[PDB]
Amino acid sequence: DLPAGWMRVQDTSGTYYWHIPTGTTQWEPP
Numbered sequence: 001d002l003p004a005g006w007m008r009v010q011d012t013s014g015t016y017y018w019h020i021p022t023g024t025t026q027w028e029p030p
């Protein structure tokens with residue numbers, strides 16, 4: 001249950017999180 005505007009991303013590198021308006025990207029769930 002991500003807050004508004006956030007996505008969970010997975011790719012070869014791992015699973016991390018992405019804030020669409022700001023480009024903020026981080027490991028920790030928001």
